[PDB]
């Protein structure tokens, strides 16, 4: 399954592949409001683990916290 | 389509009306301020019997949430008469008093006898 | 001149002729500054033609 490949790719955050995506999305996330609704999980994989079954009534909000 | 304005403005999107599957409340709440509940009682005061026999009016105590319009259409329907004008004050007691000046084609003293005051 | 000196919400009641004088810029501008601007409108618009005709007759010798 693809999820195990996404799981172990998401552990290589220091890689050129993920350092591009964790930076270019982090730009996109600053331009949005501090609390807004995401249309889907950013990580389809990680949301599977924590209980997000992709059916109607399940919601995902992308909120930022000042560091 | 060409951009004349350097402003972006939200387009006039379509909005539909309320087409509800059920009315929220079942029935309309009836008018509890009737023609009857809007005129409490007339004043049989010496000052008011003067006003009936001198100025050709009737002096009523009215519900505090009544207009001069609501009194006129109450006095017209309750006493088969017509009203020239209405003048309303709220008393120090808190109740509203209406100086209901009748149209001069009616004797207020002959209709004060009809409502049944002596 | 020719306009009623009255509190400005009364002007609804006043007839049209009480609020202006019968002229170009009537009840808006004075007669003096109109007829000096009939001159200023003219002598500028003439001076445009004076440099318009000179423009081609300063070009045409080259």
């Amino acid at each position: 399954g693809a999820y195990k490949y996404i799981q172990e790719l998401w552990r290589k955050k220091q890689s050129d592949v993920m350092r591009f995506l964790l930076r270019v999305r982090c730009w996109q996330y600053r331009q949005l409001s501090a609390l807004h609704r995401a249309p889907r999980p950013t990580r389809p994989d990680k949301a599977r683990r924590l209980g997000y079954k992709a059916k109607q009534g399940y919601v995902i909000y992308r909120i930022r916290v000042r560091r | 389509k060409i951009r004349t304005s350097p402003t972006f403005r939200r387009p006039k999107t379509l909005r539909l009306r309320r087409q509800p599957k059920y009315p929220r409340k079942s029935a309309p709440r009836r008018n509890k301020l009737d023609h009857y509940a809007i005129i409490k009682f007339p004043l049989t005061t010496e000052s008011a019997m003067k006003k009936i026999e001198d100025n050709n009016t009737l002096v009523f105590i009215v519900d505090v949430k009544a207009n001069k319009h609501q009194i006129k259409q109450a006095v017209k329907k309750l006493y088969d008469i017509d009203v020239a004008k209405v003048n309303t004050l709220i008393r120090p007691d808190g109740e509203k008093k209406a100086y209901v000046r009748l149209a001069p084609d009616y004797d207020a003293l002959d209709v004060a006898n009809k409502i049944g005051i002596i | 001149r020719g306009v009623r000196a009255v509190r400005p919400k009364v002007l609804m009641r006043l007839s049209k002729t009480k609020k202006h004088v019968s002229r170009a810029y009537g009840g808006s501008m004075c007669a003096k500054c109109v007829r000096d601007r009939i001159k200023r409108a003219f002598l500028i618009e003439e001076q445009k033609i004076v440099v318009k005709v000179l423009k081609a007759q300063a070009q045409s010798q080259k």
């Binding site: 996404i6 998401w10 591009f20 996109q28 889907r40 | 060409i2 951009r3 350097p6 402003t7 | -």
Partner: protein, 225 residues
């Protein structure tokens, strides 16, 4: 015949002569914060050095071969909800009184049968939003000797299946008649993705400066020589 009152009255749109005409300002509109965002997101893919794992998705199977594959995939589409009931009806008529070869949809079904090696041809989409779903798959099909191509439109690829979008589409089985045409996709694709993959791993994307910044560079180099 020419009515002589009709005068040609041209307007002088010089600086401080006449009013400016209501001309086109499509590129001077203060856009909404979402329209502004999605454009200067597309700039960061062309400014910032895109890694060859992410860049390789830009290398797409062209118009001349895309229509050849979509019409071949049109033969083997998985059926719709309306046709499903009509076959399941036939099981009940035999009850009271084999599956054809199809496409495989989604990253999870496809990737299982690339190591298992049932995939004869895999079709990647180029614009899958969380890209990591597919990033590994161009290499995963390479090592398992599976022909992979990349299409433009995850929606038009997701229109082969009867859904909105689909990430990946894999060919497992095809009929003997359309077997020939399936091999002639692979004959063109494997030479253009799998066999030149050592070059795809080297091909970084972006790092192309602004057209009015490359214009700056192309005016200084004209000056010094």
């Amino acid at each position: 015949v020419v009515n002589p009152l009709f005068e040609k009255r041209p307007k002088n749109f010089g600086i401080g002569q006449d009013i400016q005409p209501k001309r086109d300002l499509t590129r001077f509109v203060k856009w909404p914060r979402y329209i502004r965002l999605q454009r200067q997101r597309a700039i960061l893919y062309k400014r910032l050095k895109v890694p060859p794992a992410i860049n390789q998705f830009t290398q797409v199977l062209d118009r001349q071969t895309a229509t050849q594959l979509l019409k071949l995939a049109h033969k083997y589409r998985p059926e719709t909800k309306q046709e499903k009931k009509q076959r399941l009806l036939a099981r009940a008529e035999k009850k009271a009184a084999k599956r054809p070869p199809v496409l495989r949809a989604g990253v999870n079904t496809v990737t299982t049968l690339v190591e298992n090696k049932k995939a004869q041809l895999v079709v990647i989409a180029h614009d899958v939003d969380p890209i990591e779903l597919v990033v590994f798959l161009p290499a995963l099909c390479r090592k398992m000797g599976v022909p992979y191509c990349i299409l433009k439109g995850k929606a038009r690829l997701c229109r082969l299946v009867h859904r909105k979008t689909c990430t990946t589409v894999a060919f497992t089985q095809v009929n003997s008649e359309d077997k020939g045409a399936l091999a002639k996709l692979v004959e063109a694709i494997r030479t253009n993705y799998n066999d030149r993959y050592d070059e795809i791993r080297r091909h970084w994307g972006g790092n192309v400066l602004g057209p009015k910044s490359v214009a700056r560079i192309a005016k200084l180099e004209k000056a010094k020589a």
